[PDB]
């Protein structure tokens, strides 16, 4: 786990702790996508919704995938590629999510989906580069994708965040594998 993979896991844990201590809504109020016009210029918020988790399962599953795919992308393609994947997926997923359902949402899984789509498609279209999605983990990803679409979990799923996430990672692996 390089510096990006790491600061991210850290920031997510630090934020999850604040949500336990201060409560979910308090932290949302500070970190959610702008939910009032008076907040539109608070720029951290287009990204910081990625940092908030609402259950132990949410955090744990997201950081497992982040650690593994995030970490792969970091070590083999560099810190910079992971930064850009993250900023773009966070911002785009946040955008589509809020459009469909309003600003009240959170989670790294828009980003994790971009890493899934990215690492898979780059492995298919580009063997040499050194990044692949192992067949077993394609299955575990597909099931993970499927669960959200049909809502087979306690709390409701950000479905725009997911389709938007994956689309970004596919677009970027496409553009990258092209060379």
């Amino acid at each position: 786990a390089g510096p990006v993979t790491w600061v991210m896991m850290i920031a997510c844990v630090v934020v999850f702790i604040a949500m336990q201590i201060l409560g979910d809504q308090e932290v949302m109020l500070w970190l959610a996508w702008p939910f009032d016009p008076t907040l539109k210029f608070e720029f951290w918020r287009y990204f910081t919704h990625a940092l908030m988790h609402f259950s132990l399962m949410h955090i744990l599953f997201n950081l497992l995938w982040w650690w593994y795919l995030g970490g792969a992308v970091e070590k083999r393609l560099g810190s910079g590629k992971l930064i850009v994947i993250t900023l773009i997926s966070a911002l785009l997923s946040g955008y589509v999510q809020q459009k469909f359902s309003g600003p009240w949402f959170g989670g790294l899984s828009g980003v994790v989906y971009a890493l899934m789509g990215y690492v898979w498609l780059r492995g298919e279209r580009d063997p040499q580069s050194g990044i692949y999605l192992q067949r077993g983990l394609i299955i575990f990803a597909l099931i993970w994708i499927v669960a959200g679409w049909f809502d087979l979990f306690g709390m409701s799923m950000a479905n725009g965040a997911h389709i938007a996430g994956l689309a970004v990672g596919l677009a970027m692996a496409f553009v990258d594998s092209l060379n």
């Binding site: 979910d24 949402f105 997911h162």
Partner: peptide, 4 residues
């Protein structure tokens, strides 16, 4: 509150 939707998770992701």
């Amino acid at each position: 509150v939707r998770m992701x």
